[PDB]
Design a protein around this motif. Structure first.
Motif, short mmCIF file in Angstrom:
data_model
loop_
_atom_site.label_atom_id
_atom_site.label_comp_id
_atom_site.label_asym_id
_atom_site.label_seq_id
_atom_site.Cartn_x
_atom_site.Cartn_y
_atom_site.Cartn_z
N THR A 7 0.86 -1.21 0.00
CA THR A 7 0.00 0.00 0.00
C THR A 7 0.89 1.25 0.00
OG1 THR A 7 -1.83 -1.10 1.08
CG2 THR A 7 -1.75 1.29 1.30
N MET A 8 1.91 1.28 0.85
CA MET A 8 2.83 2.43 0.94
C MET A 8 3.45 2.71 -0.43
SD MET A 8 6.27 2.84 3.20
CE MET A 8 7.29 1.81 2.15
N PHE A 9 3.96 1.68 -1.09
CA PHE A 9 4.61 1.85 -2.41
C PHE A 9 3.57 2.28 -3.45
CE2 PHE A 9 7.85 -1.24 -0.63
CZ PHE A 9 8.83 -0.29 -0.47
N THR A 10 2.41 1.62 -3.47
CA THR A 10 1.33 1.92 -4.44
C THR A 10 0.92 3.39 -4.31
OG1 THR A 10 0.58 -0.33 -4.53
CG2 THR A 10 -1.03 1.33 -5.18
N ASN A 11 0.71 3.87 -3.08
CA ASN A 11 0.33 5.28 -2.82
C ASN A 11 1.35 6.19 -3.50
OD1 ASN A 11 -1.77 4.41 -1.24
ND2 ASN A 11 -0.83 4.94 0.72
N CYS A 12 2.63 5.91 -3.33
CA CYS A 12 3.73 6.73 -3.89
C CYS A 12 3.62 6.75 -5.42
CB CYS A 12 5.08 6.21 -3.43
SG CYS A 12 6.44 7.29 -3.93
N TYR A 13 3.40 5.59 -6.03
CA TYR A 13 3.40 5.44 -7.51
C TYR A 13 2.13 6.04 -8.13
CZ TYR A 13 7.20 2.11 -6.69
OH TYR A 13 8.36 1.51 -6.30
N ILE A 14 1.01 6.08 -7.42
CA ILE A 14 -0.26 6.61 -8.00
C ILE A 14 -0.37 8.12 -7.76
CG2 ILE A 14 -1.36 4.34 -7.91
CD1 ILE A 14 -3.13 5.33 -5.63
N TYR A 15 0.33 8.70 -6.78
CA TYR A 15 0.25 10.15 -6.46
C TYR A 15 1.33 10.95 -7.20
CZ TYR A 15 0.21 14.66 -4.16
OH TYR A 15 0.16 16.00 -3.92
N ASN A 16 2.57 10.45 -7.23
CA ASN A 16 3.76 11.20 -7.73
C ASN A 16 4.01 10.86 -9.20
OD1 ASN A 16 4.84 12.50 -5.13
ND2 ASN A 16 4.57 10.35 -4.56
N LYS A 17 4.56 11.81 -9.97
CA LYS A 17 4.88 11.62 -11.41
C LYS A 17 5.97 10.56 -11.53
CE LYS A 17 5.47 13.92 -15.79
NZ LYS A 17 4.08 13.52 -16.10
N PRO A 18 5.86 9.60 -12.48
CA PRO A 18 6.94 8.65 -12.75
C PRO A 18 8.28 9.37 -12.96
CG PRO A 18 4.98 8.03 -13.99
CD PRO A 18 4.67 9.35 -13.32
N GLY A 19 9.35 8.83 -12.38
CA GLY A 19 10.71 9.38 -12.53
C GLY A 19 11.03 10.49 -11.53
N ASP A 20 10.04 10.99 -10.78
CA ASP A 20 10.27 11.98 -9.69
C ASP A 20 11.24 11.36 -8.68
OD1 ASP A 20 8.52 13.82 -10.82
OD2 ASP A 20 7.09 13.81 -9.15
N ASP A 21 12.00 12.20 -7.97
CA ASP A 21 12.97 11.74 -6.94
C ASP A 21 12.29 10.75 -5.99
OD1 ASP A 21 14.98 13.26 -8.06
OD2 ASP A 21 15.03 14.77 -6.46
N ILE A 22 11.11 11.09 -5.48
CA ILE A 22 10.40 10.24 -4.48
C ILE A 22 10.08 8.87 -5.10
CG2 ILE A 22 8.09 11.15 -4.97
CD1 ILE A 22 9.48 10.11 -1.51
N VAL A 23 9.76 8.83 -6.40
CA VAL A 23 9.41 7.56 -7.10
C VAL A 23 10.68 6.72 -7.27
CG1 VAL A 23 8.52 6.54 -9.24
CG2 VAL A 23 7.34 8.48 -8.21
N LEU A 24 11.82 7.34 -7.61
CA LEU A 24 13.11 6.62 -7.72
C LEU A 24 13.49 6.06 -6.34
CD1 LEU A 24 15.07 9.05 -10.07
CD2 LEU A 24 13.99 6.89 -10.67
N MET A 25 13.21 6.81 -5.28
CA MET A 25 13.49 6.38 -3.89
C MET A 25 12.58 5.19 -3.54
SD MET A 25 13.89 10.17 -2.27
CE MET A 25 14.65 9.87 -0.68
#
Ligand SMILES: CCOC(=O)CNC(=O)CN(Cc1ccc2nc(-c3cc(C)c(=O)n(C)c3)n(CC3CCOCC3)c2c1)C(=O)c1c(F)c(F)c(N=[N+]=N)c(F)c1F
Length: 125
Positions: free
Chosen positions: A88-106
């Motif tokens: 859920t934590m990872f999914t939330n990050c991937y559905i909210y933030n733009k692909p390739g954003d620093d937070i998504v790479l993290m």
């Protein structure tokens, strides 16, 4: 900001399992010390970060601070509830933030490490 997810269950007896020992001592411990862990170590503070749409888009907030407390408090009845919270934590990050954003790479680096460890999850016993 919503109230943080509950981290203690007063109606649940204390029970260790090989898989929950592994999830705390190997999986959580390894992710927590990672250089990219820090954005995931607490609930997203939408107020401090000025993200008025975050808790509109994310219905089920989750973070490693909550997961850490849940493991320490023996909140999970089984390993799969804990694995679901990480997912859920990872999914939330991937559905909210733009692909390739620093937070998504993290998130991608942490998820790679997470799946590496979950692939070596001990048997149910
Ligand atoms: C009390 C003082 O008041 C303030 O100054 C309030 N603002 C701050 O502190 C804000 N911060 C720190 C901070 C703390 C936790 C956060 N968690 C997230 C975050 C967001 C989103 C949508 C999300 O989905 N998840 C899962 C997490 N973000 C966003 C960032 C996530 C990583 O990539 C860059 C955006 C966070 C931001 C930063 O600006 C700050 C920073 F971002 C740094 F990268 C940094 N590194 N260096 N060097 C640094 F030093 C920073 F200070």
């Amino acid at each position: 900001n919503p109230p943080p997810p509950e981290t203690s269950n007063p109606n649940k007896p204390k029970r260790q399992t090989n898989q929950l020992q592994y999830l705390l001592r190997v999986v959580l411990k390894t992710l927590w010390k990672h250089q990219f862990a820090w954005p995931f170590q607490q609930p997203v503070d939408a107020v401090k970060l000025n993200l008025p749409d975050y808790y509109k888009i994310i219905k089920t907030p989750m973070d490693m601070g909550t997961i850490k407390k849940r493991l320490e408090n023996n909140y999970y009845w089984n390993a799969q509830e804990c694995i679901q919270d990480f997912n859920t934590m990872f999914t939330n990050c991937y559905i909210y933030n733009k692909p390739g954003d620093d937070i998504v790479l993290m998130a991608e680096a942490l998820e790679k490490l997470f799946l590496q460890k979950i692939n070596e999850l001990p048997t149910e016993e």
